[PDB]
Amino acid sequence: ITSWLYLGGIVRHARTQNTTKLEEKPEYALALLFVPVVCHYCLLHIPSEDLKERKPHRYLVVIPEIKDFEDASQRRWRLQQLETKQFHVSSLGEAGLLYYSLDDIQPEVAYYQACQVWLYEKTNKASRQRTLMSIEEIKIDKNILITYQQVQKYFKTNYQIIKYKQIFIKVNPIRSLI
DNA sequence: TAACAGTGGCCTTATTAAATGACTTCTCCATGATCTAC
């Protein structure tokens, strides 16, 4: 298999393309084929540069840790509700929590979920393709989810500045930092 | 040897709390089709 199937499954040494390649069983190859359906994609905004002066290009991939097929399926189909402007974040943790923002908290059930956020970013301006730069593991509990839900409810939402044939989505730095 | 040990009234009035411009520049790609040599 190659990096398009397994993210990060790069061939380090191009002169050994035949041998030094990640190998998987056919069933796991089919699973890796179906990977992109579940994982969700967020855009990372660097606050050092102004939003207007350059549009975002960094991509965050939220890969959840599966506890049950039904649970993750329901979570993804529920995440289908979110507006597109919510997927623009200014921190990896914001995206990780946003994946689980719609989750219903049960007081009688011990809530625990985990996910990984993968950052894809061009090394230079003329880079042809994005490169995996960092992987962040996020573990969320009931208190973290409740606090993030309150923060989302009470803090200002993402503004949608609309200019000529471009929709510049201005993120909330306070929400991302918190 | 004594009796005093200051009685008053004020404790800043204005005014201005920055003016500019810069907010990185390069490069290091990965992978498969094809060319080619043994």
PDB file of C-alpha atoms (C1' of nucleotides) in Angstrom:
ATOM      1  CA  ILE A   1       0.000   0.000   0.000  1.00  0.00           C
ATOM      2  CA  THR A   2       0.962   3.657  -0.317  1.00  0.00           C
ATOM      3  CA  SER A   3       0.381   6.918   1.554  1.00  0.00           C
ATOM      4  CA  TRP A   4      -2.981   7.486  -0.146  1.00  0.00           C
ATOM      5  CA  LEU A   5      -4.358   4.383   1.585  1.00  0.00           C
ATOM      6  CA  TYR A   6      -2.614   4.659   4.963  1.00  0.00           C
ATOM      7  CA  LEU A   7      -1.935   8.261   5.941  1.00  0.00           C
ATOM      8  CA  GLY A   8       1.759   8.626   6.676  1.00  0.00           C
ATOM      9  CA  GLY A   9       2.598   5.272   5.090  1.00  0.00           C
ATOM     10  CA  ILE A  10       5.290   6.985   3.050  1.00  0.00           C
ATOM     11  CA  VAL A  11       8.194   5.262   1.324  1.00  0.00           C
ATOM     12  CA  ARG A  12      11.171   6.882   3.044  1.00  0.00           C
ATOM     13  CA  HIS A  13      13.767   5.656   0.533  1.00  0.00           C
ATOM     14  CA  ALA A  14      12.587   6.087  -3.052  1.00  0.00           C
ATOM     15  CA  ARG A  15      15.412   3.876  -4.352  1.00  0.00           C
ATOM     16  CA  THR A  16      13.786   0.920  -2.534  1.00  0.00           C
ATOM     17  CA  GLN A  17      10.284   1.434  -3.919  1.00  0.00           C
ATOM     18  CA  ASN A  18       9.754  -2.270  -4.630  1.00  0.00           C
ATOM     19  CA  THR A  19      10.679  -3.649  -1.201  1.00  0.00           C
ATOM     20  CA  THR A  20      10.334  -0.996   1.529  1.00  0.00           C
ATOM     21  CA  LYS A  21       6.581  -0.585   1.144  1.00  0.00           C
ATOM     22  CA  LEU A  22       3.925  -1.065   3.808  1.00  0.00           C
ATOM     23  CA  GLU A  23       2.049  -4.328   3.269  1.00  0.00           C
ATOM     24  CA  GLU A  24      -1.452  -5.205   4.462  1.00  0.00           C
ATOM     25  CA  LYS A  25      -3.892  -8.066   4.119  1.00  0.00           C
ATOM     26  CA  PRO A  26      -6.655  -7.612   1.508  1.00  0.00           C
ATOM     27  CA  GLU A  27      -9.397  -7.132   4.112  1.00  0.00           C
ATOM     28  CA  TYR A  28      -7.389  -4.470   5.928  1.00  0.00           C
ATOM     29  CA  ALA A  29      -6.655  -2.920   2.533  1.00  0.00           C
ATOM     30  CA  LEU A  30     -10.414  -2.653   1.977  1.00  0.00           C
ATOM     31  CA  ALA A  31     -10.789  -1.082   5.421  1.00  0.00           C
ATOM     32  CA  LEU A  32      -8.063   1.461   4.652  1.00  0.00           C
ATOM     33  CA  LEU A  33      -9.936   2.145   1.411  1.00  0.00           C
ATOM     34  CA  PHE A  34     -13.058   2.992   3.400  1.00  0.00           C
ATOM     35  CA  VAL A  35     -11.135   5.109   5.943  1.00  0.00           C
ATOM     36  CA  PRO A  36     -12.010   8.555   4.457  1.00  0.00           C
ATOM     37  CA  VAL A  37     -15.751   8.172   5.127  1.00  0.00           C
ATOM     38  CA  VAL A  38     -15.523   8.386   8.919  1.00  0.00           C
ATOM     39  CA  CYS A  39     -12.684  10.858   9.448  1.00  0.00           C
ATOM     40  CA  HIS A  40     -13.547  14.548   9.226  1.00  0.00           C
ATOM     41  CA  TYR A  41     -11.615  17.520   7.886  1.00  0.00           C
ATOM     42  CA  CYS A  42     -11.075  20.950   9.435  1.00  0.00           C
ATOM     43  CA  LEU A  43      -9.232  24.025   8.178  1.00  0.00           C
ATOM     44  CA  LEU A  44      -6.562  25.549  10.418  1.00  0.00           C
ATOM     45  CA  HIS A  45      -6.243  29.341  10.480  1.00  0.00           C
ATOM     46  CA  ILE A  46      -2.884  30.828  11.457  1.00  0.00           C
ATOM     47  CA  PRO A  47      -3.614  34.061  13.369  1.00  0.00           C
ATOM     48  CA  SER A  48      -0.178  35.553  12.655  1.00  0.00           C
ATOM     49  CA  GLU A  49      -1.284  36.168   9.069  1.00  0.00           C
ATOM     50  CA  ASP A  50      -4.495  38.087   8.468  1.00  0.00           C
ATOM     51  CA  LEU A  51      -7.419  36.090   7.107  1.00  0.00           C
ATOM     52  CA  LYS A  52      -8.053  38.534   4.256  1.00  0.00           C
ATOM     53  CA  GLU A  53      -4.411  38.709   3.177  1.00  0.00           C
ATOM     54  CA  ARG A  54      -4.173  34.917   2.712  1.00  0.00           C
ATOM     55  CA  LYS A  55      -6.778  32.159   2.677  1.00  0.00           C
ATOM     56  CA  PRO A  56      -6.154  29.052   4.813  1.00  0.00           C
ATOM     57  CA  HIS A  57      -4.444  25.994   3.374  1.00  0.00           C
ATOM     58  CA  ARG A  58      -3.567  23.830   6.396  1.00  0.00           C
ATOM     59  CA  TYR A  59      -5.828  20.788   6.741  1.00  0.00           C
ATOM     60  CA  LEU A  60      -6.642  18.990   9.993  1.00  0.00           C
ATOM     61  CA  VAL A  61      -7.845  15.383   9.823  1.00  0.00           C
ATOM     62  CA  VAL A  62      -9.827  14.237  12.862  1.00  0.00           C
ATOM     63  CA  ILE A  63      -9.425  10.458  13.136  1.00  0.00           C
ATOM     64  CA  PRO A  64     -11.607   9.107  15.974  1.00  0.00           C
ATOM     65  CA  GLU A  65     -10.881   6.120  18.177  1.00  0.00           C
ATOM     66  CA  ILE A  66     -13.655   3.618  17.498  1.00  0.00           C
ATOM     67  CA  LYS A  67     -15.451   2.047  20.456  1.00  0.00           C
ATOM     68  CA  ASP A  68     -18.419   0.659  18.507  1.00  0.00           C
ATOM     69  CA  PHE A  69     -19.549   0.655  14.886  1.00  0.00           C
ATOM     70  CA  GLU A  70     -23.016   1.952  15.760  1.00  0.00           C
ATOM     71  CA  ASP A  71     -21.699   4.665  18.083  1.00  0.00           C
ATOM     72  CA  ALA A  72     -19.202   6.060  15.575  1.00  0.00           C
ATOM     73  CA  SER A  73     -21.711   5.797  12.721  1.00  0.00           C
ATOM     74  CA  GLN A  74     -24.273   7.787  14.697  1.00  0.00           C
ATOM     75  CA  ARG A  75     -21.620  10.326  15.687  1.00  0.00           C
ATOM     76  CA  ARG A  76     -20.584  10.912  12.067  1.00  0.00           C
ATOM     77  CA  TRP A  77     -24.154  11.117  10.770  1.00  0.00           C
ATOM     78  CA  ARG A  78     -24.889  13.600  13.568  1.00  0.00           C
ATOM     79  CA  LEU A  79     -21.788  15.641  12.717  1.00  0.00           C
ATOM     80  CA  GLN A  80     -23.372  15.978   9.285  1.00  0.00           C
ATOM     81  CA  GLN A  81     -25.547  18.683  10.914  1.00  0.00           C
ATOM     82  CA  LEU A  82     -22.708  21.144  11.505  1.00  0.00           C
ATOM     83  CA  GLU A  83     -22.391  24.241   9.349  1.00  0.00           C
ATOM     84  CA  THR A  84     -19.355  24.562   7.101  1.00  0.00           C
ATOM     85  CA  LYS A  85     -18.170  27.675   8.949  1.00  0.00           C
ATOM     86  CA  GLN A  86     -17.705  25.616  12.129  1.00  0.00           C
ATOM     87  CA  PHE A  87     -14.978  23.491  10.518  1.00  0.00           C
ATOM     88  CA  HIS A  88     -12.565  26.443  10.408  1.00  0.00           C
ATOM     89  CA  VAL A  89     -10.506  26.391  13.611  1.00  0.00           C
ATOM     90  CA  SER A  90      -7.332  27.981  14.953  1.00  0.00           C
ATOM     91  CA  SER A  91      -6.061  25.025  17.013  1.00  0.00           C
ATOM     92  CA  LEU A  92      -5.951  21.243  16.755  1.00  0.00           C
ATOM     93  CA  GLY A  93      -7.750  20.818  20.071  1.00  0.00           C
ATOM     94  CA  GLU A  94     -10.676  22.901  18.774  1.00  0.00           C
ATOM     95  CA  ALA A  95     -11.135  20.463  15.865  1.00  0.00           C
ATOM     96  CA  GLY A  96     -10.794  17.451  18.149  1.00  0.00           C
ATOM     97  CA  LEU A  97     -13.497  18.791  20.454  1.00  0.00           C
ATOM     98  CA  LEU A  98     -15.681  19.894  17.531  1.00  0.00           C
ATOM     99  CA  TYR A  99     -15.790  16.305  16.298  1.00  0.00           C
ATOM    100  CA  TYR A 100     -17.464  15.414  19.617  1.00  0.00           C
ATOM    101  CA  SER A 101     -19.332  18.694  20.187  1.00  0.00           C
ATOM    102  CA  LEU A 102     -22.761  17.291  19.284  1.00  0.00           C
ATOM    103  CA  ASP A 103     -22.384  14.278  21.595  1.00  0.00           C
ATOM    104  CA  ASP A 104     -25.100  13.912  24.227  1.00  0.00           C
ATOM    105  CA  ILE A 105     -23.760  13.638  27.776  1.00  0.00           C
ATOM    106  CA  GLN A 106     -25.399  10.989  29.954  1.00  0.00           C
ATOM    107  CA  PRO A 107     -24.973  11.675  33.698  1.00  0.00           C
ATOM    108  CA  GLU A 108     -25.341   7.981  34.567  1.00  0.00           C
ATOM    109  CA  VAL A 109     -22.784   6.840  31.951  1.00  0.00           C
ATOM    110  CA  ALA A 110     -19.047   7.491  32.272  1.00  0.00           C
ATOM    111  CA  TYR A 111     -18.291   9.426  29.091  1.00  0.00           C
ATOM    112  CA  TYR A 112     -14.856   8.901  27.547  1.00  0.00           C
ATOM    113  CA  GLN A 113     -13.787   9.441  23.937  1.00  0.00           C
ATOM    114  CA  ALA A 114     -10.438   9.828  22.197  1.00  0.00           C
ATOM    115  CA  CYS A 115      -9.291  10.983  18.775  1.00  0.00           C
ATOM    116  CA  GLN A 116      -6.204  11.960  16.800  1.00  0.00           C
ATOM    117  CA  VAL A 117      -5.789  15.178  14.812  1.00  0.00           C
ATOM    118  CA  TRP A 118      -3.363  15.072  11.882  1.00  0.00           C
ATOM    119  CA  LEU A 119      -1.963  18.344  10.539  1.00  0.00           C
ATOM    120  CA  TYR A 120      -1.263  18.573   6.801  1.00  0.00           C
ATOM    121  CA  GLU A 121       0.637  21.671   5.716  1.00  0.00           C
ATOM    122  CA  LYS A 122       2.751  22.751   2.758  1.00  0.00           C
ATOM    123  CA  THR A 123       6.429  22.953   3.690  1.00  0.00           C
ATOM    124  CA  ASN A 124       7.031  25.951   1.404  1.00  0.00           C
ATOM    125  CA  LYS A 125       4.943  28.271  -0.757  1.00  0.00           C
ATOM    126  CA  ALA A 126       5.721  26.371  -3.971  1.00  0.00           C
ATOM    127  CA  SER A 127       5.017  22.965  -2.404  1.00  0.00           C
ATOM    128  CA  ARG A 128       3.071  20.731  -4.779  1.00  0.00           C
ATOM    129  CA  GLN A 129       1.403  18.643  -2.057  1.00  0.00           C
ATOM    130  CA  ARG A 130       0.694  18.870   1.650  1.00  0.00           C
ATOM    131  CA  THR A 131       2.918  17.094   4.167  1.00  0.00           C
ATOM    132  CA  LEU A 132       2.073  15.460   7.484  1.00  0.00           C
ATOM    133  CA  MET A 133       3.660  17.715  10.101  1.00  0.00           C
ATOM    134  CA  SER A 134       2.239  16.762  13.505  1.00  0.00           C
ATOM    135  CA  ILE A 135      -0.154  14.256  15.061  1.00  0.00           C
ATOM    136  CA  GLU A 136      -1.945  15.225  18.272  1.00  0.00           C
ATOM    137  CA  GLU A 137      -3.786  12.718  20.460  1.00  0.00           C
ATOM    138  CA  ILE A 138      -6.824  14.129  22.267  1.00  0.00           C
ATOM    139  CA  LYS A 139      -8.609  12.374  25.127  1.00  0.00           C
ATOM    140  CA  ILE A 140     -11.860  13.998  26.248  1.00  0.00           C
ATOM    141  CA  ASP A 141     -13.939  13.280  29.347  1.00  0.00           C
ATOM    142  CA  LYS A 142     -17.332  14.468  30.569  1.00  0.00           C
ATOM    143  CA  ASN A 143     -15.982  17.668  32.137  1.00  0.00           C
ATOM    144  CA  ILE A 144     -14.012  18.694  29.042  1.00  0.00           C
ATOM    145  CA  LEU A 145     -16.992  18.079  26.762  1.00  0.00           C
ATOM    146  CA  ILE A 146     -19.358  19.997  29.051  1.00  0.00           C
ATOM    147  CA  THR A 147     -16.973  22.951  29.287  1.00  0.00           C
ATOM    148  CA  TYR A 148     -16.454  23.021  25.521  1.00  0.00           C
ATOM    149  CA  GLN A 149     -20.204  22.861  24.908  1.00  0.00           C
ATOM    150  CA  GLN A 150     -20.715  25.816  27.250  1.00  0.00           C
ATOM    151  CA  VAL A 151     -17.901  27.700  25.498  1.00  0.00           C
ATOM    152  CA  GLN A 152     -19.489  27.048  22.101  1.00  0.00           C
ATOM    153  CA  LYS A 153     -22.912  28.111  23.371  1.00  0.00           C
ATOM    154  CA  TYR A 154     -21.790  31.362  25.003  1.00  0.00           C
ATOM    155  CA  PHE A 155     -18.798  32.617  23.010  1.00  0.00           C
ATOM    156  CA  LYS A 156     -19.213  34.393  19.687  1.00  0.00           C
ATOM    157  CA  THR A 157     -19.588  32.055  16.725  1.00  0.00           C
ATOM    158  CA  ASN A 158     -17.460  32.170  13.583  1.00  0.00           C
ATOM    159  CA  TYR A 159     -18.104  35.254  11.472  1.00  0.00           C
ATOM    160  CA  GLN A 160     -18.619  34.897   7.722  1.00  0.00           C
ATOM    161  CA  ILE A 161     -17.038  37.889   5.994  1.00  0.00           C
ATOM    162  CA  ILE A 162     -18.077  37.834   2.336  1.00  0.00           C
ATOM    163  CA  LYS A 163     -15.979  39.614  -0.286  1.00  0.00           C
ATOM    164  CA  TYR A 164     -15.871  39.406  -4.078  1.00  0.00           C
ATOM    165  CA  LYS A 165     -16.341  35.725  -4.994  1.00  0.00           C
ATOM    166  CA  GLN A 166     -14.647  34.672  -1.745  1.00  0.00           C
ATOM    167  CA  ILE A 167     -16.140  33.698   1.617  1.00  0.00           C
ATOM    168  CA  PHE A 168     -13.543  34.605   4.248  1.00  0.00           C
ATOM    169  CA  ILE A 169     -14.525  32.804   7.456  1.00  0.00           C
ATOM    170  CA  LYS A 170     -13.192  34.690  10.477  1.00  0.00           C
ATOM    171  CA  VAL A 171     -12.588  32.266  13.348  1.00  0.00           C
ATOM    172  CA  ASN A 172     -12.874  33.121  17.038  1.00  0.00           C
ATOM    173  CA  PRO A 173      -9.380  33.116  18.605  1.00  0.00           C
ATOM    174  CA  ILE A 174     -10.795  32.958  22.137  1.00  0.00           C
ATOM    175  CA  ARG A 175     -12.711  29.742  21.460  1.00  0.00           C
ATOM    176  CA  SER A 176      -9.671  28.115  19.856  1.00  0.00           C
ATOM    177  CA  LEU A 177      -7.387  29.106  22.733  1.00  0.00           C
ATOM    178  CA  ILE A 178      -9.845  27.883  25.367  1.00  0.00           C
TER     179      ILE A 178
ATOM    180  C1'  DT B   1      10.900  74.268  93.002  1.00  0.00           C
ATOM    181  C1'  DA B   2       6.181  75.376  87.621  1.00  0.00           C
ATOM    182  C1'  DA B   3       3.728  75.460  83.097  1.00  0.00           C
ATOM    183  C1'  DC B   4       3.482  75.417  78.630  1.00  0.00           C
ATOM    184  C1'  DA B   5       6.014  71.874  73.796  1.00  0.00           C
ATOM    185  C1'  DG B   6       1.452  76.157  68.715  1.00  0.00           C
ATOM    186  C1'  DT B   7      -2.859  78.006  67.878  1.00  0.00           C
ATOM    187  C1'  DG B   8      -4.792  78.053  60.789  1.00  0.00           C
ATOM    188  C1'  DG B   9      -5.148  76.937  56.083  1.00  0.00           C
ATOM    189  C1'  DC B  10      -3.870  74.770  51.901  1.00  0.00           C
ATOM    190  C1'  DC B  11      -1.035  69.255  49.961  1.00  0.00           C
ATOM    191  C1'  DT B  12      -1.581  71.548  42.692  1.00  0.00           C
ATOM    192  C1'  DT B  13      -4.155  73.994  39.367  1.00  0.00           C
ATOM    193  C1'  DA B  14      -3.738  72.263  32.404  1.00  0.00           C
ATOM    194  C1'  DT B  15      -2.233  69.130  28.979  1.00  0.00           C
ATOM    195  C1'  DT B  16      -0.640  65.711  25.999  1.00  0.00           C
ATOM    196  C1'  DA B  17       0.083  59.563  26.951  1.00  0.00           C
ATOM    197  C1'  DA B  18       2.754  58.590  20.531  1.00  0.00           C
ATOM    198  C1'  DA B  19       3.657  59.838  15.962  1.00  0.00           C
ATOM    199  C1'  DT B  20       5.767  54.916  10.546  1.00  0.00           C
ATOM    200  C1'  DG B  21       6.844  50.759   8.423  1.00  0.00           C
ATOM    201  C1'  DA B  22       8.140  46.361   8.007  1.00  0.00           C
ATOM    202  C1'  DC B  23       4.520  40.627  10.774  1.00  0.00           C
ATOM    203  C1'  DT B  24      10.118  36.096   6.569  1.00  0.00           C
ATOM    204  C1'  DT B  25      12.955  34.991   2.547  1.00  0.00           C
ATOM    205  C1'  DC B  26      14.734  29.206  -0.042  1.00  0.00           C
ATOM    206  C1'  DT B  27      14.888  24.265  -0.007  1.00  0.00           C
ATOM    207  C1'  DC B  28      14.457  19.477   1.073  1.00  0.00           C
ATOM    208  C1'  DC B  29       7.750  16.045  -3.082  1.00  0.00           C
ATOM    209  C1'  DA B  30       6.023  11.190  -3.582  1.00  0.00           C
ATOM    210  C1'  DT B  31       4.947   7.812  -6.700  1.00  0.00           C
ATOM    211  C1'  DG B  32       4.124   5.337 -10.666  1.00  0.00           C
ATOM    212  C1'  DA B  33       4.754   4.960 -15.926  1.00  0.00           C
ATOM    213  C1'  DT B  34       8.383   4.532 -18.881  1.00  0.00           C
ATOM    214  C1'  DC B  35      13.477   4.111 -20.617  1.00  0.00           C
ATOM    215  C1'  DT B  36      16.948   1.494 -20.481  1.00  0.00           C
ATOM    216  C1'  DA B  37      20.642  -1.791 -19.516  1.00  0.00           C
ATOM    217  C1'  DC B  38      21.746  -6.589 -18.330  1.00  0.00           C
TER     218       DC B  38
END
